[PDB]
Symmetry: D2
Subunit: 222 residues, 4 copies
């Protein structure tokens, strides 16, 4: 009843088909990786980056968590960021939200009293919600959900950009761009939400919060 | 400069092909998910559970982090576990490690003084390594790398079974199986390193460390 | 070289004096505790709640961290909160900040690129600062340092009231008050910066940010 | 009923008494701190470092948490460590456990299934327990409790020593010692458990786990 056979057989079939189509498909990545992309996205079973962009092994390094959240104080996510930017030298960071995201719904409707770890974890979503409350007032449930997904994509794009890892990379002239994308599970389609950010100049143009003010706040003091 | 167009063309072409084959491929998961697997594996760019098991949207809920580590005190991993076991009622947890894993190499060689967050992050791999000194000392750096991989997988499976989430699911008679599997980037195949675990008895048989003593420790006192 | 003898002499001399004064000073708390206060304040070496409130062993349960920060996703602070509210049934939570706090200075001036863990840790202070730009921009670096302190205290009080722990205690009618106080290392005095908060109504009156909307956000939708 | 008056009045009385005894007691630390000690200890209301060593403001920088736990992946504790060692340049680190510690009891007797954050948090204690299970088998409840306190003091002393912050400090010849102490709440007395550790040489002599093996594991590979 709890038996892995269908899955190993499926992996078997999959590996032959790929090895037939091309002889070096697997062996060329046997002993290193040089991906050009880090993807950060939701753990949601409908959203598989390698599958949805049709990539081959070695192309995209992946963080997936509930809500596609990025925070300087989550060492799980930050270590995906530091290792890829500093050691593997990836060139592009994809931050991907999706519609129908359960975390973003929970972020709207759950009472903070709710027990367990998921409720602790989605605190970041409540913080995006509260900052943008005027954009969400008097929308319909389904409408506010959709807006919450998009607002969350933008906040997280901001946190990637404001992260020590990225700020440092840019400061030593390493090329690195950050992309805000969103996925529709019901159609299989990706849409670009935020045009490429390649440094501070771009972020000043594309982000609604002010990255420059965030990085250089003390210049405003007398 | 850093345009996403080729990724977007590839996604559109992919989404098209899939829906032409099966017209409800996407639409049937437009408004919910009911995966049966939670998968915990490595952020590594050569290891996509969706594509190596050939699964479709809505089948596997995925956590990916550096070194496929499971810890009670990582809210990021733990909320994936809580949400999939308590809300989505998944049935199987695949804990997957892989040969040539950079995190298991670093855990063998880096000096704890090393700066940055990946070094903090991989302390769990040092702890598994230290407990297992006698199985690793004196192997070639290469044989020990492969041994570290396997030991880590086994340690993480124990962490899954010992977690508050899996423990509470079991105690209330919710069916839930845990699996240790390892993947070879050079061949695209998955071996089952540890046979299915469905509760406390299976665990006594299948794991080197003692889960019953861990959970009911006060019984070995007086 | 680095002998502890003078600390040990001082401890023995102290313990002696106290028990000579009151012979059950220690022995009455030998086997349990029943403090009425949880105190959350700064790791700073000039701020000891026990001695500035002149309290004896068994009266105040203490969390101290860099910048007196309270977050749902810090298991270290949260377990102090959970254990004291749910197991010891404390009655009052003192959230205490202090002038000349290094963490609130760093949060004003450091560039997010700065290396190391204190910089990650103090992201919460940047977030309070960014929300409050209009109260800080253009003050002298010194007036703004003092303003940051107060704003942080107020933010942390809100975090305490908004936490799952305090929310659940309140909803089950457990009496629990939250207090904002700030301390002046130069004078040894404590001012009460925010008046007692004992539940949702007091909070509506006493805090700038909106706790009711935060907790019952889905009501402002349709 | 929820009223801070007794406490402010008490702080008032305390501040005058100290200002009378010495005119510069407070004012000498108004605008900086130069403590020689970081103390890491339990949040338990019976254990107040400034009070128990009879210290004046500015003498001891303090982390307090449930169980006096030190972990590379807790940024609360690590940021107390990094800021004090790197910025303030403290000379001595005190790691203090105490008997009758509730965390260490919970670490022995709780089942992992237990809900809430404290149970997540004390996972470190279960990990010390399991590693030392042979030392705890067939002792009486009260006996195993006492032993668990002492074992935990030694593990945490080890984690301070093995931490990136300390390893790095020692590696650039910064003087820094680490001390394992324990406190008896029922007597007010401290006892030195582990003699001063000032570098690797000392740790090889005083610690039961092998710090050198932990730091230089790869030297053992062929
Ligand atoms: Zn989602
Ligand atoms: Zn890996
Ligand atoms: Zn401070
Ligand atoms: Zn304790």
């Amino acid at each position: 009843t709890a038996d892995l056979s269908p899955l190993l057989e499926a992996n078997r079939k999959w590996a032959d088909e790929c090895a037939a189509k091309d002889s070096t498909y697997f062996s060329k990545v046997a002993g290193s990786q040089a991906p050009e992309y880090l993807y950060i996205g939701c753990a949601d079973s409908r959203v598989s980056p390698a599958q949805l962009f049709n990539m081959a092994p070695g192309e995209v390094f992946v963080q997936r968590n509930v809500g596609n959240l990025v925070s300087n104080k989550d060492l799980n996510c930050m270590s995906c960021l530091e290792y890829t930017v500093d050691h593997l030298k990836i060139k592009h960071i994809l931050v991907c939200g999706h519609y129908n995201c359960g975390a973003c719904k929970a972020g709207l409707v759950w009472h903070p009293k709710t027990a367990g770890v998921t409720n602790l974890w989605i605190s970041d979503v409540r913080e995006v919600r509260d900052k943008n409350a005027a954009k969400l007032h008097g929308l319909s449930a389904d409408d506010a959900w959709d807006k919450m997904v998009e607002l969350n994509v933008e906040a997280q794009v901001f946190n990637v950009c404001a992260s020590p890892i990225v700020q440092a990379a840019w400061a030593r002239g390493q090329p690195l761009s950050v992309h805000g994308i969103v996925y529709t599970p019901g159609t299989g389609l990706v849409k670009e939400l935020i045009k490429p950010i390649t440094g501070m100049e771009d972020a000043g143009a594309l982000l609604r919060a002010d990255l420059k003010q965030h990085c250089f706040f003390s210049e405003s003091l007398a």
